[model samples]
Target: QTSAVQQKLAALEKSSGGRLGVALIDTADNTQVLYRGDERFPMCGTSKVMAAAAVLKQSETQKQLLNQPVEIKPADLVNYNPIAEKHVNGTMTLAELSAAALQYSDNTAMNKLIAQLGGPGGVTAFARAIGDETFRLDRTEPTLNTAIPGDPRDTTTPRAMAQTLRQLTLGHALGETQRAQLVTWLKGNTTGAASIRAGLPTSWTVGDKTGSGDYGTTNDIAVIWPQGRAPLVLVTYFTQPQQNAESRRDVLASAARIIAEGL
Candidate 1:
């Protein structure tokens, strides 16, 4: 029998024209609260989450610190972010880059991380190492806009994204210290306020990353902490084409609210 959560998500999918892929997990029980969890969709800026994890893993392997400085050149600039627009020329530590990327979804910061890790192939290798074969990091920020329709090159399944976030939350993907650092970056994210976090209770803390792509694809992968309860992981993706921005965001926010209240 389908759970109540699954039933609710089914109604949502119906209302949204079958473009929503959602998965909410009860961390305390390791059980899926909602189905439709495995559908793949373009990750857009959400790819930065995997990119950040890969960069952290690389740092650990190289015995490097998060504060290692890296210079930002003009060629590194990418559109759609305020950080790069503000500081086009300077040096930012790896930690700062991670923060900018996660908190603001800064394209330039993400590109820098990609460059430091030896390019997009490095990120793909990292995902493969972690048993996630579906996510691909084939384009940097500048080229991401060029992805064609039906291309899965920069895509990831909702389950894969949630599992990755879970790994980081459990401290299985990086050293405790590095994991803490990444979590901090996620918690400090300010760009996802209109996404999953919007529907959450004021007391709930969310560490998440948000992504947007062509054709009304909006995504948010979050680790939510409710007071005095186990943390929950929520992954919501919308791939419906030509939907209004407010409508798409409302769908995501409402889904988050239902899952949060049900849990």
Candidate 2:
């Protein structure tokens, strides 16, 4: 099954004319393979998955009340676009902000929520606690203020991120109650194009987050078809040196869908 999955992945990479990096894991068996792991890429908002996980874990430890309404303190926001800042003024419960960060990938909501969670320091603690040395939270106010055009605010490897998602799904990232809340938030993901979601049959529930940016990149990582054949985590990132491929999004969606169909 792995060999077959690899063949299809390779074909998609070649046909799409882009750099494709994947770190796939069968969560049930704890078996894994990496087309890329040490290979780091700008995750766009996909980095928020870890940030959100950090919040969930903290919620358990601090007895943090996620239902408590958090004022959208303007001081908490940095590097926000005008549109995001406007929305930030509206009060969002801690839970709403957390879900918005995952489901909508809202930058303001994420920045604010993570600030309440301890900003970079908080997220770093969460990652280290989970044993993800390679997962770094890089969203400092300075970097966000200095963001170059087309680059993401944070970066991570597929292997590290796949591990985070696996931890979340298996109740390793948080306590039972917080884990359930995190999973429910993930299921609300509406952030990116329907890559993993499009591939699954209606009967299967695909809980995941999708992310992309203008540099011809697309990424989706999550738990798909749990308790079914090879319950797995899939991370797909596509990029190009010269940025020639216009159809990279569909190519990624097709590749992911093909794998789901095989299952």
Candidate 3:
């Protein structure tokens, strides 16, 4: 049914000389549009989403976990963590860390939360708990952005991400309050204005997270609430060969048009 749309995407890839991986699903009917859905792409900052979920899940099993203080080590701070750097001399609650990481893409906040959740492996365990075994993280921060062409470290699949997000927000994996908390943070994201969000109708309520890495990798995972229809879950990843590395997020803008108009 999307033969023509596929042709358009093919043209998009050809022009940009990049590979685009997409996983689009309608939460209500489970309808899907997948492209290179199984391939792994660097998680970059997007890993914060899973980290936040792990935090919430862990918080559910403990007492005052979110309110517990987490020390922010100045020595452990990484690049692009303006939000967390301000709290360097102080401590932030786990809840605050989660909010900073998602809302501002704070690198230090992400690593701090990862450390609390028992490191990258712990967060991956959370992914496994939600039935997403393919999601993995071997490192943190600027290091994770290595984005080696075929190396799977700190990477996840398009379908896995979209499905996991659906499970977290729309499935039974997270308690209602916890899921709402995560969604509220996601809705405050400040990095989506130039990605898939560009093509969506302004009236549609959207909450998304974006990530970037070497090899021109750029990605966004989002849940969209539209008028008179079930919400949509999407994962869009673009990566070009290292030789001509350049982001094609604009392509995602076009792809969103195709999906929205066709729907």
Candidate 4:
């Protein structure tokens, strides 16, 4: 059965004209795996979800509330993010910042959260706590302007991210309260609405985070709820160098429909 799904995805990949990685997991029976699901790919802003989770976990132990206010500075600004730009001269609660990070992919908001939670090491440790050994947060949020310093920059396997989502859905990563809060933010996400969400039916509920970068990188991790069926966890990445963003999204949308309708 999984083989059939893999074949459909393979056909889409061939037509996409780019290197692609996909992982589709049906929570109903834990039937998972498609293509290159274990391969490492640059996570880009998609990693913000994991960072937010880590912060939430730390806050639990630190007795901190999400409503705690944090001041924003002009130096924290990152180009291409309108959410961060608007809040640069003002203040926002950590909860609001997390919402911006997930909903708008706000780089500065994500950076401030990362800094509050400690740093990359803290994020990585939180990921490990949730059993995601392959997740890595090497650089802070202003990665837009700074050169990523190494090969395989800020990479994670599709399987790892899918597993993380699975844990979140099961209330294993964060407590039930925190998990529900995070899910609300993800479901409200406005970014990447044209990716997997574009291919899903209007009746289905989709909660996801998107990531993109130069060298043809586009990625999305999502939990999709069918109207009358079980939820599906989907993670996809395109690392085809020089591929335009539009084409990348189209490829993902096409693949999503294949899986969503097939299931």
Candidate 5:
């Protein structure tokens, strides 16, 4: 499966001192750019997108679920909660929390959503139900950020995640309205401007979720709508040894540029 694309990406990884994985699928013609597409990488905060989709999927069967409010308490506060911290001991509707988690990668908001979905096991069950056997979310926030080099938990391959993202966002896993809502939330994500968005042209519309974790892990999964072309599902996952932590994350941005230019 080695091609010029993978070779160039591998060279970039060598220069950046990290392991890299990428999967780019052009939904129009199914042309792809795949590098280490099967290797597992930690989910980190990127799992919030799936958790959001799971909640919305459940909404299809339940009534007014998106409007359901979740109460936050002092006990719910965690170390990295930028958004949820402001509303401690208050309540937020599920839709608001989804926006907070997806747009801002809010730690406490995601944990609350996970709890509403019945915890880590329920998350895995949701992935399985949606036909993603390789994806798993074993732990909640902060802990899931561990990103142990060889740990099997909270990991999925670049290709697997891209497929799942495409299914939930671009296909028919969730109802049409709910799927649109997911895209709307993703488009509002502010964390990815420096990741995938950095490599895309200004005219293109990009919606993504980014995951940063232990051992210099930086990941982004996105659905990109190009101005003059069909949309794409692009995923990039990079991890370095702790020593490489000081290196900039241009590895992701560079990979995005390399893949997009080839199209």
Candidate 6:
């Protein structure tokens, strides 16, 4: 079965003229195929996906209040755009910060959320609490590549990402209301390129977040066919030396749609 899929993917690689990594999980049966390029890669905005989930989990555990006002501190601010900075002086609830961080992949927004959620230690505690050894919230700069970390504190895999999203989607990652509320916020993400979305049909709904870097890594992970089709989850991360944004995004979306449609 993997042979046939790899054949298709190899053909895709040749035609698209890009290196690729992909994972197709049969959530219904707990089956998977791991390709060579499928090793854990730097998870960009996709990290925010987990970060957002952690926020929801913490909120459920009473570590932080969802609707409570969280003040954004100076340390929480990262290399941010002007518009995002505007949200700086104002206060945001935990829910709003999580939504803004993942939906828009706002660096400063996430930093603030992480700090409010109990900092990187809180995120790690949440992962440990959920029994997920694969997820880690390393230093933000290296994760975003704004400034290289003093040590290598960045990592995550396709299956880890898929399982996290799977848990959240099924309301298994947190309490009933927590999962429900988290999914609602996840549906608001609108920042990633058209990669995963381009393959979606009009009748189907896909919600995901995209992550990129100046160094040329592209990532988009989410649950596709969320509305009417079979529930298919994906996590695709890639790096290219000289690909333009439009080209890389086209490849990302194309891979996403193919993986979704194939499932």
Judging by lDDT against the true structure, name the best candidate. Answer: 5
Candidate 2: tens digits of C-alpha lDDT, residues 198-251: 665666666777666545667778776644565778777666654433435576
Q: List candidate 5 segments past 4 Å from native.
A: none
lDDT of each: 0.79, 0.68, 0.86, 0.80, 0.88, 0.65
| Model 5 per-residue lDDT at 10 | 87
Residue-level lDDT tens digits of model 6 in 31-53: 66444343556666677766777
lDDT score, candidate 1: 0.79
Off by over 4 Å in 4: 62-64, 144-150, 243-247
Per-residue lDDT for 1-263 in model 5, tens only?
68877888989989998889999989989877889899988878889988999999999998799898889898988768888888887888898889999999998999988998899878888899999999898898889888888889999999899989999989898999999999999998888878888988899999999999888899999999999898999999988888347434578889998888888
TM-score versus the correct structure, for each prediction: 0.91, 0.82, 0.95, 0.91, 0.97, 0.84
The prediction achieving the highest TM-score against the true structure is: 5
Q: For every model in order, what is the number of clashing pairs? A: 0, 0, 0, 0, 0, 1
lDDT of 3 by residue, 1-263 (tens): 55665666667768877888888899778988877789888888889999999999988878599998888778878988887788888899999999989988998999988899788899999999999989998897879887888888999998899999999877889888899988999899998888889978988988999888888888888899988889999888888789347776787777777777767
Instruction: Tell me the spans in candidate 2 whose CA falls farther than 4 Å from its real position.
Output: 73-90, 140-153, 226-230, 242-247, 261-263
Report the Cα lDDT for residue 31, model 4. 86
Candidate 6 regions with alpha-carbon error over 4 angstroms: 14-18, 36-38, 73-76, 81-83, 141-143, 146-152, 226-228, 242-247
Q: How do these models rank on lDDT, best leading? A: 5, 3, 4, 1, 2, 6
Off by over 4 Å in 1: 61-65, 145-149, 243-247
Could you give candidate 1's per-residue lDDT for residues 20-133 as a string of tens digits?
778777788897764566766778888898888888887786665577888877777767667766665778888788888889998889998888778888888888888777
Residue 178's lDDT in candidate 3: 91
Model 4 vs. true fold: TM: 0.91
Worst 10 contiguous positions by lDDT, candidate 6: 142-151
Ranking 1 against 4 by TM-score, winner: 4
